[PDB]
């Protein structure tokens, strides 16, 4: 059925999006477990490697 085919395709999309947020889990974990956070980030600087 169209509803079940849509449900399986969107379950596959949910697994792909969970993979692309599991790439962020480790940095979120280090930011919540760290002792001192420095904002703004070093990676967002407009002169990063100069």
């Amino acid at each position: 059925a169209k509803r079940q085919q849509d449900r399986l395709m969107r379950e596959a999309a949910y697994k792909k999006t969970n993979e692309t947020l599991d790439r962020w889990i480790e940095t979120v974990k280090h930011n919540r477990r760290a002792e001192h956070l420095v904002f703004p980030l070093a990676q967002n600087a407009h002169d990063r490697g100069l």
Binding site: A1, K2, R3, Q4
Partner: protein, 159 residues
């Protein structure tokens, strides 16, 4: 009645004739019915759904037995959504078309929800006690109702 047959009217009438013998051991509205009316216009893309029109006391004569009649009409004929309805020729007629569309399940409410401009969307809710076997038939219900009447409605179980 009203018809001289098309290509599939004689096939569905032969199915109604063949359900008399060579089978069950169940016939109450099967012998007092003749060739009546049928229509074959698409639902979604790829699939179609057969509707058959019924004389107006034979709608309660068919409310007598519709379990496993529509199952064998789905299985033994063409593997598509079978659907019976009365034939008619205003708002009470469209209400009748809805409540004879949904045959096991009683509709509860109609919510005519407008939008932030003049556009409006009707949405008729169903009964909660029967949910599992109807949800794959809901888009067929909505599309057959659009194709017969012209008013876009969408069917939804309440949550």
């Amino acid at each position: 009645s009203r018809q001289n047959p098309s290509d599939l009217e004689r096939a569905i009438a032969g199915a109604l004739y063949d359900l008399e013998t060579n089978t069950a051991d169940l016939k109450a509205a099967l012998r007092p019915l003749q060739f009546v009316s049928a229509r074959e216009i698409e639902v979604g893309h790829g699939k179609k759904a057969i509707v058959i029109f019924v004389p107006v006391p034979a709608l309660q004569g068919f409310h007598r037995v519709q379990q496993r009649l529509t199952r064998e009409l789905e299985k033994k004929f063409s593997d598509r959504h079978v659907l019976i309805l009365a034939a008619r020729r205003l708002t009470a007629v469209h209400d009748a078309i809805l409540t004879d569309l949904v045959y096991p399940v009683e509709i509860v409410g109609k919510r005519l929800r407008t939008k932030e401009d003049g556009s409006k969307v009707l949405k008729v809710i169903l009964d909660e006690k029967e949910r599992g076997g109807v949800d794959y038939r809901l888009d067929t219900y909505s599309e057959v109702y659009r194709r017969l009447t012209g008013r876009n409605v969408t069917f939804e179980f309440p949550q």
